[PDB]
Design an enzyme around this catalytic site. Structure first.
Site, mmCIF file in Angstrom:
data_model
loop_
_atom_site.group_PDB
_atom_site.id
_atom_site.type_symbol
_atom_site.label_atom_id
_atom_site.label_comp_id
_atom_site.label_asym_id
_atom_site.label_seq_id
_atom_site.Cartn_x
_atom_site.Cartn_y
_atom_site.Cartn_z
ATOM 1 N N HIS A 41 0.810 -1.314 0.019
ATOM 2 C CA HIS A 41 0.016 0.294 0.166
ATOM 3 C C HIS A 41 0.890 1.264 -0.057
ATOM 4 O O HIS A 41 0.315 2.290 -0.005
ATOM 5 C CB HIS A 41 -1.023 0.073 1.221
ATOM 6 C CG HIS A 41 -0.323 0.183 2.509
ATOM 7 N ND1 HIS A 41 0.005 1.326 3.036
ATOM 8 C CD2 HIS A 41 -0.200 -0.579 3.530
ATOM 9 C CE1 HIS A 41 0.306 1.407 4.251
ATOM 10 N NE2 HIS A 41 0.367 0.055 4.502
ATOM 11 N N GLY A 143 3.293 6.381 9.137
ATOM 12 C CA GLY A 143 4.598 6.199 8.854
ATOM 13 C C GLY A 143 5.259 5.257 9.242
ATOM 14 O O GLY A 143 6.293 4.597 8.869
ATOM 15 N N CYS A 145 4.306 1.981 8.753
ATOM 16 C CA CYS A 145 4.181 0.748 8.051
ATOM 17 C C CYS A 145 5.820 0.181 7.377
ATOM 18 O O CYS A 145 6.253 1.279 7.223
ATOM 19 C CB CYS A 145 3.161 0.799 6.944
ATOM 20 S SG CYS A 145 1.303 1.234 7.693
#
Lengths: 306, 306
Positions: A41, A143, A145
């Site tokens: 993503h 942030g 991930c």
């Protein structure tokens, strides 16, 4: 003596963290040999995430639309592919700090260390357990991930988790490093039910053993029980059923303390039925389930890695 | 979101841990530039520790009588000195992995990360608070001495603690890196009284703010109180008095949440008098005092290092 929730030393993993930017989205990636692994993503805007068609979004991207930065070194992307929910970015250079490593899919109730990162830089390290419902209770801001979870065996890093999302309920979900989610979750911003969470019974028992080793003994009673009798109390209190495999894993702790496993289960059953009555165990007013039997043995013998 | 007890990334410190052997005693040392720092009781046998005369014992030793090992490469010892309770062993080579670093003496109530080590190799990392009575509640087995505590500010490692001993009561004592003990302790194996420990009030309030930021709000009551009235309740429950300096340190957390400090003190004062009644705060059934206000801001803002 003493007993602490201890994370693995994070040095070997710090040297593998990079920043991955695609359009306006920036997150963390894992750079091993000449491949960078990151959540797919990264190619989504905040509006795509409501209903993303990942195959179509990825087709709009080329190798040069992926900005990969390791510290202040920019890496050259020469190939990209999607494996389940992770993106694999082939880069020009092999990571010179690549440790010996494995990719592992862990089981519910196992624990691991999380190196929380932002913009490719490490923020902190803590220990976590994969809950029986396949979520974790971490600390992950926007942030984070692509932050990874791992265990270390002497010199080998076993990567087991990559962070992907926070559920509306505030718990965290992610994948193994082949990109398969733990649990029924999907990388889409929608309501997602985690199942009923339960307590990891064998972990609580290991922690009671650690408490005995450290001098906490007030909870030791004069009862015992059977496996079937304990499991009747286990399911009333949302505890995972105890099997013979779990009894076997507790063998060495039983042997060191001289307390039979079914005797420790009788102390646990009285703690569940009567509570703790304002008392504490190893500094906790709750029953702890985030130490595996192997964690307890490790802390108690002082194993090292380097 | 989420809130975890988070340690600093230990990579910069792992590269500084060496093994120091003198006679039969082996412990951990810290190799920065061309100096190795370690507890001076490495020069004692297990029997010397009952009543050691360190000046006389050190005189029986020469520069070659100290074995310093970095991984599997041995160092060339060209000088030795005793500064308070640490030994400074001057070696031939500057540590090529020496980070930017400072030696700092911390205050009670401040926190730091501990890199627990055995035989010069890292075992695990956890966050610790210096208690008001100058002990820490760590996890330290035999051979752990010389393990260090530290904080990180971007690229600079601030070393603040070196582990020296376990008190008979099972808590831990150590020095700054100039060798001065924290608290009234000495490096002698004898009965040593730690004073009454008290709870770090300003830390508990910071953690209550972290709980609100993360969605836990049930403890917010609808009373307030004054500083003197709170300090009256604080002293009954062995809490440290809150000063205006502490109120000011909590200012930015107050500003973010819109909850005045003295309203948060009223919720805390009713938590002390009524307990939690089977509820939890950030997953804990006790009031946590191991997060400073700066720890909370760091974790909630996602600050990164290197």
């Amino acid at each position: 003596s003493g007993f602490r929730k201890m994370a693995f030393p994070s040095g070997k993993v710090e040297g593998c963290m990079v920043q991955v930017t695609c359009g306006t989205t920036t997150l963390n990636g894992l750079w091993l040999d000449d491949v960078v692994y990151c959540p797919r993503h990264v190619i989504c805007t905040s509006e795509d995430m409501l209903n993303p068609n990942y195959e179509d979004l990825l087709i709009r991207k080329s190798n040069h639309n992926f900005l990969v930065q390791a510290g202040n070194v920019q890496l050259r992307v020469i190939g990209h592919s999607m494996q389940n929910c992770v993106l694999k970015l082939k880069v020009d250079t092999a990571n010179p700090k690549t440790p010996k490593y494995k990719f592992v899919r862990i089981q519910p109730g196992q624990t691991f260390s999380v190196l929380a990162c932002y913009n490719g830089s490490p923020s902190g390290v803590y220990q976590c357990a994969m809950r029986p419902n396949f979520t974790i209770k971490g600390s992950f801001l926007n942030g984070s991930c692509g932050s990874v979870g791992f265990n270390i065996d002497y010199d080998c890093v076993s990567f087991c988790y990559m962070h992907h999302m926070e559920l509306p309920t505030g718990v965290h979900a992610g994948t193994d490093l082949e990109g398969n989610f733990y649990g029924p979750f999907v990388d889409r911003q929608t309501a997602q039910a985690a199942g009923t969470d339960t307590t990891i019974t064998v972990n609580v028992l290991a922690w009671l053993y650690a408490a005995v080793i450290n001098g906490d003994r007030w909870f030791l009673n004069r009862f015992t029980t059977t496996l079937n009798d304990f499991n009747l109390v286990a399911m009333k209190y949302n505890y995972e059923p105890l099997t013979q495999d779990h009894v076997d894993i507790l063998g060495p702790l039983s042997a060191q303390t001289g307390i039979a496993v079914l005797d420790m289960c009788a102390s646990l059953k009285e703690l569940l039925q009567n509570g703790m009555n304002g008392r504490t165990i190893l500094g906790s007013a709750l029953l702890e389930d985030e130490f595996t039997p192997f964690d307890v043995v490790r802390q108690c013998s002082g194993v090292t890695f380097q």
